[PDB]
Design a protein around this ligand. Sequence first.
Ligand SMILES: [Mg+2]
Lengths: 5, 233, 240, 244, 231, 222, 250, 211, 235
Amino acid sequence: XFLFX
Amino acid sequence: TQQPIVTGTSVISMKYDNGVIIAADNLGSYGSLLRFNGVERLIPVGDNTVVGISGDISDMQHIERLLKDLVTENAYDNPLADAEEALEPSYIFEYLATVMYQRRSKMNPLWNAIIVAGVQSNGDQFLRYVNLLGVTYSSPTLATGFGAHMANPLLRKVVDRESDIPKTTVQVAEEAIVNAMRVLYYRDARSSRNFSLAIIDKNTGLTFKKNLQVENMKWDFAKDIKGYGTQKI
Amino acid sequence: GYDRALSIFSPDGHIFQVEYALEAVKRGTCAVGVKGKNCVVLGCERRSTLKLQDTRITPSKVSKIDSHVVLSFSGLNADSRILIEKARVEAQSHRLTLEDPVTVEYLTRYVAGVQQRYTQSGGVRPFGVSTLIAGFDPRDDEPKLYQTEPSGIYSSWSAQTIGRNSKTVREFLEKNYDRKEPPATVEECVKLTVRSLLEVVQTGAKNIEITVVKPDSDIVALSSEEINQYVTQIEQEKQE
Amino acid sequence: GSRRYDSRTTIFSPEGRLYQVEYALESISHAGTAIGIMASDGIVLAAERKVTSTLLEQDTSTEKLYKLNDKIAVAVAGLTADAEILINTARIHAQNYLKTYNEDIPVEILVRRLSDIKQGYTQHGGLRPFGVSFIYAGYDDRYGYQLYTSNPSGNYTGWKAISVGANTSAAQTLLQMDYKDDMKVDDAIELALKTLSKTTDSSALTYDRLEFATIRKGANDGEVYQKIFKPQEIKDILVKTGIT
Amino acid sequence: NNYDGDTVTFSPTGRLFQVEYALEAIKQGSVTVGLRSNTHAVLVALKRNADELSSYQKKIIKCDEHMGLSLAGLAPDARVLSNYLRQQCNYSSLVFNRKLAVERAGHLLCDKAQKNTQSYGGRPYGVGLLIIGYDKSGAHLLEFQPSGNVTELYGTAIGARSQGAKTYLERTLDTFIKIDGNPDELIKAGVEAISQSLRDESLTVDNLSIAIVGKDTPFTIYDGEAVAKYI
Amino acid sequence: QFNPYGDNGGTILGIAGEDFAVLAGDTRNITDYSINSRYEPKVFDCGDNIVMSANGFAADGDALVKRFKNSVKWYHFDHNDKKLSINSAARNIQHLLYGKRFFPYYVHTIIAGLDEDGKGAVYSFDPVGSYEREQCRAGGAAASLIMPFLDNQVNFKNQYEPGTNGKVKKPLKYLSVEEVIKLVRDSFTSATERHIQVGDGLEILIVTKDGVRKEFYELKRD
Amino acid sequence: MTDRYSFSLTTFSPSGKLGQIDYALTAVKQGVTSLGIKATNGVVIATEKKSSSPLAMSETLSKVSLLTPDIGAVYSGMGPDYRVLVDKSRKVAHTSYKRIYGEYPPTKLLVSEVAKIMQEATQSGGVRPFGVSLLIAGHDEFNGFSLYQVDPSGSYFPWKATAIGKGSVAAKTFLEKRWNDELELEDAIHIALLTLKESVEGEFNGDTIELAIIGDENPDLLGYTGIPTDKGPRFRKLTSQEINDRLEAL
Amino acid sequence: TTLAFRFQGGIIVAVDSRATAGNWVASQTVKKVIEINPFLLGTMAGGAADCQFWETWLGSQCRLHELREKERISVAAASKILSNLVYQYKGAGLSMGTMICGYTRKEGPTIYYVDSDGTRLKGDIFCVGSGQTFAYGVLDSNYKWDLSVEDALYLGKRSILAAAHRDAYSGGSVNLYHVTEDGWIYHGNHDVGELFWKVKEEEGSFNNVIG
Amino acid sequence: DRGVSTFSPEGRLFQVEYSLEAIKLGSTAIGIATKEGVVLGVEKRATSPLLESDSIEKIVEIDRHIGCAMSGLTADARSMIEHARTAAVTHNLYYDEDINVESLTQSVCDLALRFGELMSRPFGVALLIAGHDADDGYQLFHAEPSGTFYRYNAKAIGSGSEGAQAELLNEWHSSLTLKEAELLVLKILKQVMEEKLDENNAQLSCITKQDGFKIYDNEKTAELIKELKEKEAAE
Ligand SMILES: [Mg+2]
């Protein structure tokens, strides 16, 4: 896997 | 969450021009490769479907009861239960597929690999696989456990693609399945010599063969094998 | 649980349990609300058939919901306590989540919502209570006065009265209250409130309670002697 | 179904009264008279036992006067069984408050909560209200000596002197006549007994037909003592005031 | 009289009056017709308006690609029962990869309606439904009544003056049953049938509501200018 | 201890044109080093001119596509057969995915279709429902092989105008359906060579205003 | 389905009467006479064994019940209502006292718990009051011997001596004349048998009369030896023979 | 990398556009600012789904407040709705770094820092994300309260650029917002690729780089 | 007594029929739908002159594209409005779009019959739900406590409904402008109202695609009342 700045 | 105690080994199947073939040995093995044979792992549902189950025997017997239960239920208030509104392989598979996935999602899976082999009402061959994770896939040849590793390669020589199915006869398909069962006996420690084979043909119906044995095995060459390299005697 | 529908419709389209709740309000001691230019005053009747009362400890007719909002009522005293508690809890709940005290309109809308819910819930009877809710919104100098009733309808009033002989004191306010020019000062507003109660009460002794609410959480209750001075002034001016 | 047999205990009359509350008050008016009188230096609780029998064990009996904590007592008028349910609730509420704040419960807070339970039975649940009126006699460090009453409606009010149960009309007139604000406990004791003696439906008021209790500061230096009078102690106070 | 207070009370002659009163709601409802051949099944509905400024109450609800009904009586009850049918059609698809048989649809409505006639506190459904569908055994028409009685028919009608259309279909039975592979002609027979239940008012463009399902025809509803052909 | 997740391999690719959109996927389904099927489709027409693929754990992927198809069906029932716009579908799928935030679907989801202005649209989702509209997205096993190539050939990244000293970028422009299918076919043949889980067959679903068309192409079976 | 009766079946009438409690007391009045007498060194409780049929074995039906080793109960009114109250009374002596303090409850507190159960049947939804009055005789270290009456309302009163049921009015008058504060246990048993003979019409012997005492500790009835502090139950049910012995010198 | 700072001319909000799955650069075109309402902004840092879902949910809760109270929600109230929500989910594994930035007449320009730990902070300057340290260094060094709007916009842009360069998990493009009494105003998307060289040439910085 | 969900011998629900009687006692509310927008107007009907009329909220916003006028026991409408607003916002959260006026109405009507022995009685209030969506354009719906809703070109509910509806029958055509519709609502309100119509005892609103749902100021309504009188005196 999931996206994560 | 559980651990399987007594298990069944590979189930192998393939399509031919007029139907499908499925086979499974009659053995229940323990954890340390101990045996307990006298286990039928092919469940005929109606006269158009055979369900081949591998993995935990206790969970297999639970699924067996569900299928028996399903047939009873379908007959309830159904005048066409033996005709147009009879259970189809696609219906039986989808029920089982639904159960396997909602069990894995409750973290209490049925520790099995299932192949549903049958012929549909329009004569279409049906072959599809479901397992304890609820993963499903179809192919001209389907096999579980060791069968996937050893049987599939042999069966795929006969039917590599969909276009090969019309060219494949029941005599050829049965030979391929029976040969594949012998190879599994040679190389699988949890396999047995005794097995059951079922043919579902659109023209000739369902044929169920029990107490089959592996024959024409090659052992003669073993006498010439001495030591592990340098031993001459 | 006890599920019975007690508040139901009649053939003529009335809900008798809600209408019989209004009758309980009409039996209640008179309560009046008058809002001036920079204040609101809540006047309340206390029936004089009860002597040997301990006025120190006896529940006061006007209740603080927060430091800036007050609630008076006519009807069943026991029922009023349940609305006051729920309102006080909601006032602290609003401060906790919105980081701002309730507006008078919001607190009214909540209390009216509770009264409404008891008119179409199983196993409960409506509140035998009408409320006057008065105060000043945070950082605002515009006086607010709202009325609620058992049905759950609420609305804003320049001045309003509820309870026994409320129709008499409403008659008085309707001709004595000018919309274009409300009571400019605290004294003027308190006087008009006392005058309106003196049409109904009997004697201006320990029978009248007055509470004056002003902007920025400035609420004070008047004593006997303080109220008695207004009674003495009105009666001397009347004799003309 | 069951709708047919429902008395609807929590509805309004066309006049806007609560039937079951009004009928419960009618029940209480037939109960033995209970009087509370608040003085500057203590509170008196006096109660008349309901037509005593000669073979009733008087000394080890509790009908009218119950202890809630060390600083609060109640006089009961109505169904004794109903009162005991509410008394055990009040005793628990008091200990819950002490556990939470490490301070004895203020009298009004205990009264309000017990009154709020009664209210609940008149607005929801479809059960009969509690056929009980209480006189609460208590002391706290905020308001000092306090008298309250609660009734089945759940309404409560504060008093200098009050009666509940039978002949309250007559009792309240006699108390209103002889009571004054600078009264002592010993004077309040005499008033309570004289009042019961005139309002009683019995031929003559005797020790065996009475329950008596005082809340004084008679103990050494800024502490409150609850005295639930023994039969012999009632017999003595009845001779001393010259009623027997 | 004394035995019509609730649905849990039999009358001395063994009648359920609350069920009979629910049945009365259907008779007050606007007429709707159902008929079928071997290839197609048709629903025709006379929609009712409050006045000339109002819209015409929608009578026909789709349940799946192969099944739907027309209603007469309490519209909200039709919504509850049609929503239940949608879920049972949907359950059958998701779990069994199987289109729900029209006969099983009937059985499920019957059993849902029944429970509401044996329990205190609840009430019977106040709506009648005509279910049409095409499943593995061909075309089907069902009549639902909130007593729980479901009936499979070649044709029928429910609502005010329904007896007129029901008599016509009884006469025409031998003709319309053999309208195979011709949708328009089977609708025409349905429109001529509902016409026998009209008084003073006639079929207009925004008044008539038609639905059809069949062999190579998903359940589709025709309203407005789409039904102008059949006037 | 029972592990509820598995990896069925496969790789998917969505590309948005001017008046069209394509969603491609290989047809190979695998477990570990075994081939389950050489033809098991995982790119589906969901109705309302929306094509969908949930690549990763096939069981979770089948479950999600099944639930979304059902979501489209009930959107018709509840909103008078109204067409589900691609943006509305994308938001619905976020809620389906985030619904299982603490027992996630182990899939990478791509949907393709036309937006309400008739222009090609592609949306991509993470396992727990974070989504974004994109011109170009590869998902699954060979995403890392395909994605940089698409950056270069679709979005013309790192390409400058010859002679301009690398000051003027190569201008962006819409590709024809013919030119896009070339890049898809070359993307998958490339991925087949260098990724063991990619091969057997390539199925492309093309979405125009005229509807949903299919194209199939063989890939190497080793 | 389900218990839809969540509302009171006992309500106040306009006169302030609780009908169902009044009617319960009427049922008690129709009931067979039972009485209790408190002596200085014990308590006696007694009742007639009104036998439904002579084929019936009156031994099997026990109108006088042990609640704890030191507490016994007798009733007038509806036998079945009494039987379930004895079961509930024995259990509450354990659950709400013995399992907390490791000792049996004192008479007044067990009476208080029985009273509470009977008050609940007066106010709870979908139930009628219990149609019985109980006489509970008991001993405890700090209160000594005590006798309590419990009514359908849930009200209880302590008695020196009393009677309930059919001939209670006459029985109470008889006890008033005979009772003094110097009575020994044997004297109270003698008076109990005299009092009960008035209200009994038919046969009067040890087979038609049921009588129990709260008196001295009975080591022989304990069932074990070795713990000096455990001296045995104060409750003893008199035998058919023991009653007949005291009817000769009557 | 996200920052928001208060100055004379209102609030400056600057964010990058990179999404990463481990060392894999998933996207360079992500919108890390939610527009909520015309006077309210939300910045997102941490789990993409967690931020995206719950800040979209926050916008719905803010709309309901305004329908039920006939008044736009306060920045304090809006921030506490989100902070009270994440506190309910505390320990469940939500990952969110957030800044609720808006103007209302009663509060003025307000910035609230809110994180998945349940921390709710009011402040003039915040930097949230993996690259927050890089942004802070540039911002703190050149921050003045009496910065011009044009200079404040550049400083926010410049501070994100600084972070995008040094931080592996920040980059792609810079998105700029300005919040005043009349509401929030978009100041465009600046690709770091083109921006970096322009800034280096014009400012004469980035002397560590070759070129 | 008798059950709450009981059928009459005629086949109607007693409690629903009795609630319709409560709605007839309610103050008048009129809606008119046009191709230029939908107008909603109400009779405020203050019980006393001391009551501040601006605090009478009988026209209510559900979303930017959906308005609501009520008639009957108006306290009952609060939870219906709360549900409608939640449905409208919730749908926008799930589908990133405006919710259809019909779908919003259907959602409100699903509460109506959720009563029995759920809530204790039906709602004692009728709603005129006016809105715009891209599919079916400008729409006016009448939501009853029966759970039934009809779409209307124009509709009156409350005390003066049967008179007002007969007047709307003659006056309404398909080519009505928004300005014409505003005057028509004011004209028919003045006819059926007890007290004389002004900007304090009557309230106008409209919903347009461009500007969404707007409740008209007393100043704006006052000008339209003045414009209405002049035009009626002109012929
Ligand atoms: Mg490969």
